[PDB]
């Protein structure tokens, strides 16, 4: 028996559904930052995001990596800035879930802190939370202090300085914490760190996942030691 004294959460596609639509809006936006900055075409705009998020993790990280020095606040505000937020549905199954659970619970997520804080209003989770790494949190030095591009490379989830960081900041025990993520590298890169894992968004579990369900509040029923109450761990 291992016991769970924390459950730290991604937040895009996995405190809400894929089905809200944010994912495309995302990348169209995303898209259009291209076109905007370098006179892309649409079809190029799109190859690049594809590429630099398949290599780096964000389109972002990707262009500062490839010597663009693009704030990090530019980029949120157009690429987050514009989403439709009033298209995240408010869950109140999910915030009942999160109130009646005892253990620490933790965002962790490769947005800004001001995306974060919109979504987790329209969910109506903003407070249900104890800690937030975010971007920022991640990337202190990309604020204020000038820098090259290539000084301080963005430092992302599944990096795992990103997980490290989200460890440290958040000061917990691998050992007795859950990681629930949407991203299949994301989940591989927790295992490797020592965390459980639970995959969000689909039924079937990946090699490094330990759980897998379609929308997070299943984890009510599909993780029952969750509810556990004893304190330290022990054999049977
Ligand atoms: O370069 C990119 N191409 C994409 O298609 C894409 N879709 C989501 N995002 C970014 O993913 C992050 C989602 O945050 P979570 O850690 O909370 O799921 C946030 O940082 C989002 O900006 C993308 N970045
Ligand atoms: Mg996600």
């Known amino acids: 028996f291992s016991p769970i004294n924390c459950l730290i959460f991604a937040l ?6 894929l089905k809200t639509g944010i994912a495309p809006a995302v990348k169209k936006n995303i898209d259009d930052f291209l076109v905007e900055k370098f006179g892309f ?3 190029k705009a799109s190859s690049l995001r594809v ?7 964000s389109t972002l990280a990707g262009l500062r990596a490839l010597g663009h020095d693009v704030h990090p606040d530019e980029y949120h505000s157009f690429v987050h800035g514009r989403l439709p937020y009033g298209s995240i549905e408010p869950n109140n199954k999910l915030r009942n879930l999160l ?4 253990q620490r619970k933790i965002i962790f997520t490769n947005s800004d802190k001001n995306h974060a804080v919109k979504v987790l209003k329209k969910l109506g989770l903003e407070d249900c939370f104890e800690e937030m790494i975010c971007f920022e949190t991640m ?7 000038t820098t090259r591009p290539d000084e301080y490379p963005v430092v992302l989830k599944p990096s795992l300085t990103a997980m490290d960081i989200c460890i440290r900041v958040a000061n917990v025990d691998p050992r007795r914490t859950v990681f629930l993520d949407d991203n299949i590298h994301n989940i591989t890169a927790g ?3 020592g965390l459980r894992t639970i995959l969000v968004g689909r039924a079937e579990k ?3 996942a330990d759980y897998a369900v379609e929308t997070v509040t299943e984890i009510a029923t599909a993780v029952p030691e969750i509810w556990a109450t004893a304190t330290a761990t022990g054999g049977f």
């Not at 895009?12 to 559904?17: E, G, Q």
């Not at 590429?51 to 993790?57: A, C, S």
């Not at 109130?99 to 005892?102: A, F, P, S, V």
């Not at 990337?139 to 202090?145: D, E, K, M, T, V």
């Open 191 to 193: 295992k490797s760190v």
């Open 99 to 102: 109130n009646k659970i005892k």
């Open 206 to 208: 990946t090699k490094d």
């Open 51 to 57: 590429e630099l998020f398949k290599t780096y993790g």
């Open 41 to 43: 075409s649409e079809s």
């Open 12 to 17: 895009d596609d996995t405190l809400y559904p």
């Open 139 to 145: 990337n202190p030095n990309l604020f204020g202090s």
